[PDB]
Design a protein around this ligand. Structure first.
Ligand SMILES: [Mg+2]
Ligand SMILES: [Mg+2]
Length: 342
DNA sequence: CTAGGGTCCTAGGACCC
DNA sequence: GGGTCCTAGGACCCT
């Protein structure tokens, strides 16, 4: 009763696309991200930039101090979306059991596959080879009996490689696996887990489920399970978008409602155009706004509302501006919509 | 020196039974 | 007091 799960993951995705489309970028350090003047961050970087320590989510000013010749690119999201659609279609040639997790990656359940003599290892390799043909981009892959181990595995032999974890290999792999590598255990949780002496799955295996449940709730059950290789989550090909949002951080903080209003007027057409692609009649479940202050606290306020409406967003932003700004400056303004249920 | 696109979980009061 | 909706906030995911 053992499933075969593939996780496919594109290498340096946004950067790989820019280098394909402009070979002059192949061997110099490059990164997609907002300039330091726009208070931006790195979305991702190629391997020459990563050599300098440039990483995703690094403030761009830090990236540039580490790597002064970093070439900064704004991003071509239709180019990325197009490569995303193309790899998903490549995935469909092998199975319909496809759960995309972002533009550049997906789980595949190939348990019931007839391709490559039922070998999940060869399926993954054929998929990666096919993606290199056809798109001139490379991908890595992970093969395992459950989702999270497959997703961990695709990072281990990257770029342009794969890694297989058999059931026989699961207990050795788990024993020294850092908790922070489990998707969904982030910096905050890893630091709480570290501070009680829990660093690895082998550490958590020596723990009581009842204690984990008291101290972490449902998360403690996930921790307990994952540390044993337990991950019964099914590959689900039927997930749907639940929200759409548009926000911008300005180059300088704002302090006047007129400035905030001016920003919303430019945000709103963009929110409308994006909603309309998925919901032509603009019918929605909720809409709302987001401010982030110069002390980096953030507030959202949103409400039931039947259809995208600019004036109500302005009104709501006005209340938020007056009712919970407390005189600090504002670095981000955002608009947001919750989609209807079906 | 701290983005923008999102998902999921938690938690209190409202409301309904 | 138990479901469920409403709303806010936050950890976390991807590049
Ligand atoms: Mg990737
Ligand atoms: Mg990815």
């Amino acid at each position: 009763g053992s499933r075969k799960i593939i996780h496919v993951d594109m290498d340096c995705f946004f950067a790989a696309v820019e280098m394909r489309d402009n070979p002059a970028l192949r061997d110099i350090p490059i990164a997609i991200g907002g300039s330091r003047e726009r208070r931006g961050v790195i979305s991702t970087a190629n391997y020459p930039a990563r050599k300098f320590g440039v990483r995703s989510a690094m403030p761009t000013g830090m990236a540039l101090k580490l790597c002064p010749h970093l070439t900064l690119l704004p991003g071509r999201f239709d180019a990325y979306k197009e490569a995303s659609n193309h790899i998903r279609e490549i995935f469909s040639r092998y199975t319909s059991r496809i759960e995309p997790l972002s533009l550049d990656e997906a789980y595949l359940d190939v348990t019931d596959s007839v391709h490559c003599h039922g070998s999940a290892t060869l399926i993954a390799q054929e998929i990666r080879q096919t993606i290199f043909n056809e798109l001139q981009l490379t991908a890595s892959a992970g093969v395992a009996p459950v989702k999270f181990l497959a997703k961990i595995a695709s990072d281990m032999n990257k770029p342009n490689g794969q890694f297989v974890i058999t059931p026989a290999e699961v207990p050795a792999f788990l024993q020294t696996l850092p908790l922070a590598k489990i998707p969904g255990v982030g910096k905050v949780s890893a630091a709480k887990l570290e501070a009680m002496g829990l660093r690895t799955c082998g550490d958590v295996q020596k723990c009581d489920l009842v204690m984990l449940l008291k101290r972490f709730g449902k998360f403690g059950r996930i921790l307990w399970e994952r540390s044993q290789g337990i991950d019964e989550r099914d590959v689900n090909s039927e997930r749907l978008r639940k929200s759409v949002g548009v926000e911008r951080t300005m180059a300088e903080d704002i302090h006047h409602w007129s400035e905030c209003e001016a920003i919303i007027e430019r945000l709103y057409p963009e929110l409308e155009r994006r909603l309309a692609k998925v919901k032509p009649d603009l019918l929605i479940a909720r809409q709302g706004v987001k401010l982030k202050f110069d002390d980096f606290q953030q507030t959202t306020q949103e409400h039931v509302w039947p259809r995208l409406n600019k004036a109500d967003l302005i009104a709501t932003a006005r209340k938020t501006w007056d009712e919970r700004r407390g005189g600090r400056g504002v670095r981000l303004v955002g608009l947001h919509v919750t989609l209807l249920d079906p």
